[PDB]
Every structure is written in C-alpha cells, then in structure tokens.
C-alpha cells in the first residue's frame, strides 16, 4: 500500500571532501526518487550523478565538506528518508607491522 524502504542507510561512511556513495532500496522499481542536500540547490547537480539500476538508486556526491558529520535527505516516491553521514579525515599515515 505505502512505499517502504527495503535497504535504508543506518550509517554511511565517506571521505572528507572526496566521494559520497549512497545506495538504497524501495522494493518498487516501478517508481523513482530524488536526492536533496542542504549544500546543493536540487538533485542531479552538475557535480553529481544519479543512476537508477532496477529498483535501487545510487547518488555520487563530490566534495562533501559539511563538517564532523553531514545529514543527507532522500525522497523516494513521496517518502521521507534521512541518514547520518560520517566524514573521515584524509590521513596518509603508515601502518608498519613493527
């Protein structure tokens, strides 16, 4: 009856101002969705790509500089979807066995 997420994002991980991969399921390939961000004006930005393979939707966000964490909002057929973003610190530290 009502649209229900099949594979939500209970916790996404990405690099600081690098790449943002987000994929979810709606168990309904008959419809689609849109990705909204407080940073960008709307979805399908000139610096992002929105591909829908089957029923799932993938959104690549470049340069995700929001801070210690970011809040991503996605709408799937008049549906409210919000997940937490974990920004990682780009560190080229060395991991020696000794």
Coordinates of N, CA and C in Angstrom, one line a residue:
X1 N 0.8 -1.2 0.0 CA 0.0 0.0 0.0 C 0.9 1.3 0.0
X2 N 1.7 1.4 1.1 CA 2.5 2.6 1.2 C 4.0 2.2 0.9
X3 N 4.7 3.1 0.3 CA 6.1 2.9 -0.1 C 7.0 2.7 1.2
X4 N 7.7 1.6 1.2 CA 8.6 1.3 2.4 C 10.0 0.9 1.9
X5 N 11.0 1.6 2.5 CA 12.4 1.3 2.2 C 12.7 -0.1 2.5
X6 N 13.5 -0.7 1.6 CA 14.0 -2.1 1.7 C 15.4 -2.2 2.2
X7 N 16.2 -1.2 1.8 CA 17.6 -1.2 2.2 C 18.0 0.2 2.6
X8 N 17.6 0.7 3.8 CA 17.9 2.1 4.2 C 19.4 2.2 4.6
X9 N 19.8 3.5 4.9 CA 21.2 3.7 5.3 C 21.3 4.1 6.7
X10 N 21.5 3.0 7.6 CA 21.6 3.2 9.0 C 23.0 3.8 9.4
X11 N 23.8 4.0 8.4 CA 25.1 4.5 8.7 C 26.1 4.5 7.5
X12 N 26.2 5.6 6.8 CA 27.1 5.7 5.6 C 28.5 6.2 6.0
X13 N 29.5 5.8 5.3 CA 30.8 6.2 5.5 C 31.5 6.8 4.2
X14 N 32.1 7.9 4.4 CA 32.7 8.6 3.2 C 33.9 9.4 3.6
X15 N 34.7 9.8 2.7 CA 35.9 10.7 2.9 C 35.6 12.1 3.0
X16 N 36.4 12.9 3.6 CA 36.2 14.4 3.7 C 36.4 15.1 2.4
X17 N 35.4 15.7 1.9 CA 35.5 16.4 0.6 C 36.1 15.5 -0.5
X18 N 35.6 14.3 -0.6 CA 36.1 13.4 -1.6 C 35.0 12.8 -2.5
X19 N 34.5 11.6 -2.1 CA 33.4 11.0 -2.8 C 32.3 10.5 -1.8
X20 N 31.1 10.6 -2.3 CA 29.9 10.2 -1.4 C 29.0 9.2 -2.2
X21 N 29.1 7.9 -1.7 CA 28.3 6.9 -2.4 C 27.1 6.6 -1.5
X22 N 25.9 6.7 -2.1 CA 24.7 6.4 -1.4 C 23.7 5.5 -2.2
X23 N 23.4 4.4 -1.7 CA 22.5 3.4 -2.4 C 21.5 2.9 -1.4
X24 N 20.2 2.8 -1.8 CA 19.1 2.3 -1.0 C 18.1 1.6 -1.9
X25 N 17.2 0.9 -1.2 CA 16.2 0.1 -2.0 C 14.8 0.5 -1.5
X26 N 13.8 0.5 -2.5 CA 12.5 0.9 -2.2 C 11.5 -0.2 -2.5
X27 N 12.0 -1.4 -2.9 CA 11.2 -2.5 -3.2 C 10.1 -2.2 -4.2
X28 N 10.4 -1.2 -5.1 CA 9.4 -0.7 -6.1 C 10.1 0.0 -7.2
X29 N 10.6 -0.8 -8.2 CA 11.3 -0.3 -9.3 C 10.4 0.4 -10.3
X30 N 9.1 0.4 -10.0 CA 8.1 1.0 -10.9 C 8.2 2.5 -10.8
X31 N 8.8 3.0 -9.6 CA 8.9 4.4 -9.4 C 10.4 4.8 -9.2
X32 N 10.6 6.1 -8.9 CA 11.9 6.6 -8.6 C 12.0 7.5 -7.5
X33 N 13.1 8.2 -7.3 CA 13.3 9.1 -6.2 C 14.2 10.3 -6.5
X34 N 14.4 11.2 -5.5 CA 15.3 12.3 -5.7 C 16.1 12.5 -4.5
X35 N 17.3 13.0 -4.7 CA 18.3 13.3 -3.7 C 18.4 14.8 -3.4
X36 N 18.1 15.2 -2.1 CA 18.2 16.6 -1.7 C 19.3 16.8 -0.7
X37 N 20.0 17.9 -0.8 CA 21.1 18.2 0.1 C 21.1 19.7 0.5
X38 N 21.4 20.0 1.7 CA 21.4 21.3 2.2 C 22.5 22.2 1.5
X39 N 23.5 21.5 0.9 CA 24.5 22.2 0.2 C 24.1 22.6 -1.2
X40 N 23.7 21.6 -2.0 CA 23.3 21.8 -3.3 C 21.8 22.3 -3.4
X41 N 21.5 23.0 -4.5 CA 20.1 23.5 -4.7 C 19.1 22.4 -4.9
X42 N 19.4 21.5 -5.8 CA 18.5 20.4 -6.1 C 19.2 19.1 -6.4
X43 N 18.5 18.1 -6.9 CA 19.1 16.9 -7.2 C 19.7 16.9 -8.7
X44 N 20.5 16.0 -9.0 CA 21.1 15.9 -10.3 C 22.0 17.1 -10.6
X45 N 22.8 17.5 -9.6 CA 23.7 18.6 -9.7 C 24.8 18.4 -10.8
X46 N 25.4 19.4 -11.3 CA 26.5 19.3 -12.3 C 27.7 18.7 -11.8
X47 N 27.8 18.5 -10.4 CA 28.9 17.9 -9.8 C 28.6 16.5 -9.2
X48 N 27.4 16.0 -9.5 CA 26.9 14.7 -9.0 C 26.2 13.9 -10.1
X49 N 26.0 12.6 -9.8 CA 25.4 11.7 -10.8 C 24.4 10.9 -10.1
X50 N 23.2 10.8 -10.7 CA 22.1 10.0 -10.2 C 21.7 8.9 -11.1
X51 N 22.1 7.6 -10.8 CA 21.8 6.5 -11.6 C 20.8 5.5 -10.9
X52 N 19.8 5.0 -11.7 CA 18.8 4.1 -11.1 C 18.9 2.8 -11.8
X53 N 19.5 1.8 -11.2 CA 19.6 0.5 -11.8 C 18.6 -0.5 -11.2
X54 N 17.5 -0.7 -11.9 CA 16.5 -1.6 -11.4 C 15.5 -0.9 -10.4
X55 N 15.7 -1.2 -9.1 CA 14.8 -0.5 -8.1 C 15.6 0.3 -7.2
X56 N 16.9 0.1 -7.1 CA 17.8 0.8 -6.3 C 18.3 2.1 -6.9
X57 N 18.7 3.1 -6.2 CA 19.2 4.4 -6.7 C 20.5 4.7 -6.1
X58 N 21.5 5.1 -6.9 CA 22.8 5.5 -6.5 C 23.1 6.9 -6.8
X59 N 23.6 7.6 -5.8 CA 23.9 9.0 -5.9 C 25.4 9.3 -5.5
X60 N 26.2 9.8 -6.4 CA 27.6 10.2 -6.2 C 27.8 11.6 -5.9
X61 N 28.1 12.0 -4.6 CA 28.3 13.3 -4.2 C 29.8 13.7 -4.1
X62 N 30.2 14.6 -4.9 CA 31.6 15.0 -4.9 C 31.9 16.2 -4.0
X63 N 32.9 16.2 -3.2 CA 33.2 17.3 -2.3 C 32.1 17.4 -1.2
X64 N 32.2 16.5 -0.2 CA 31.2 16.5 0.9 C 31.8 17.2 2.1
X65 N 32.0 18.5 2.1 CA 32.5 19.3 3.2 C 31.4 19.9 4.0
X66 N 30.9 19.1 5.0 CA 29.9 19.6 5.9 C 30.4 19.7 7.3
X67 N 31.4 19.0 7.6 CA 32.0 19.1 9.0 C 32.2 17.7 9.5
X68 N 32.2 17.6 10.9 CA 32.4 16.3 11.5 C 31.3 15.3 11.1
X69 N 30.2 15.8 10.5 CA 29.1 14.9 10.1 C 28.2 15.7 9.2
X70 N 27.5 14.9 8.3 CA 26.5 15.6 7.4 C 25.2 14.8 7.4
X71 N 24.1 15.6 7.1 CA 22.8 15.0 7.1 C 22.3 14.9 5.6
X72 N 22.1 13.7 5.1 CA 21.6 13.6 3.7 C 20.1 13.2 3.7
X73 N 19.4 13.9 2.8 CA 18.0 13.7 2.7 C 17.6 13.2 1.3
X74 N 16.9 12.0 1.3 CA 16.4 11.4 0.1 C 14.9 11.1 0.1
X75 N 14.3 11.5 -1.0 CA 12.8 11.3 -1.1 C 12.5 10.2 -2.2
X76 N 11.9 9.1 -1.8 CA 11.5 8.0 -2.7 C 10.0 7.9 -2.8
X77 N 9.4 8.5 -3.8 CA 8.0 8.5 -4.0 C 7.2 9.0 -2.8
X78 N 7.3 10.3 -2.6 CA 6.6 10.9 -1.5 C 6.9 10.2 -0.2
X79 N 8.2 9.9 -0.1 CA 8.7 9.2 1.2 C 9.8 10.0 1.8
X80 N 9.8 10.0 3.1 CA 10.8 10.7 3.9 C 12.0 9.8 4.3
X81 N 13.2 10.1 3.8 CA 14.4 9.2 4.1 C 15.5 10.1 4.5
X82 N 16.0 9.9 5.7 CA 17.2 10.7 6.2 C 18.2 9.7 6.9
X83 N 19.5 9.9 6.5 CA 20.5 9.1 7.1 C 21.7 10.0 7.6
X84 N 22.5 9.5 8.5 CA 23.7 10.2 9.0 C 24.9 9.9 8.2
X85 N 25.7 11.0 8.0 CA 26.9 10.9 7.2 C 28.2 11.0 8.1
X86 N 29.1 10.0 7.9 CA 30.3 10.0 8.7 C 31.5 10.5 7.9
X87 N 32.0 11.7 8.1 CA 33.1 12.2 7.4 C 34.5 11.8 8.0
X88 N 35.3 11.2 7.1 CA 36.6 10.7 7.5 C 37.7 11.7 7.3
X89 N 38.8 11.6 8.0 CA 39.9 12.5 7.9 C 41.0 11.9 7.0
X90 N 41.2 12.5 5.8 CA 42.2 12.0 4.9 C 43.6 12.0 5.5
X91 N 44.0 10.8 5.9 CA 45.3 10.7 6.5 C 46.2 9.6 5.8
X92 N 47.4 10.0 5.4 CA 48.3 9.1 4.7 C 49.3 8.4 5.7
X93 N 48.8 8.1 6.9 CA 49.6 7.5 7.9 C 50.1 6.1 7.4
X94 N 51.3 5.7 7.9 CA 51.8 4.4 7.6 C 51.5 3.4 8.6
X95 N 51.2 2.2 8.2 CA 50.9 1.1 9.1 C 52.0 0.0 9.0
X96 N 53.1 0.2 9.8 CA 54.2 -0.8 9.8 C 53.8 -1.9 10.7
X97 N 54.2 -3.1 10.3 CA 54.0 -4.4 11.1 C 54.7 -4.3 12.4
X98 N 55.8 -3.6 12.5 CA 56.6 -3.5 13.7 C 56.1 -2.2 14.5

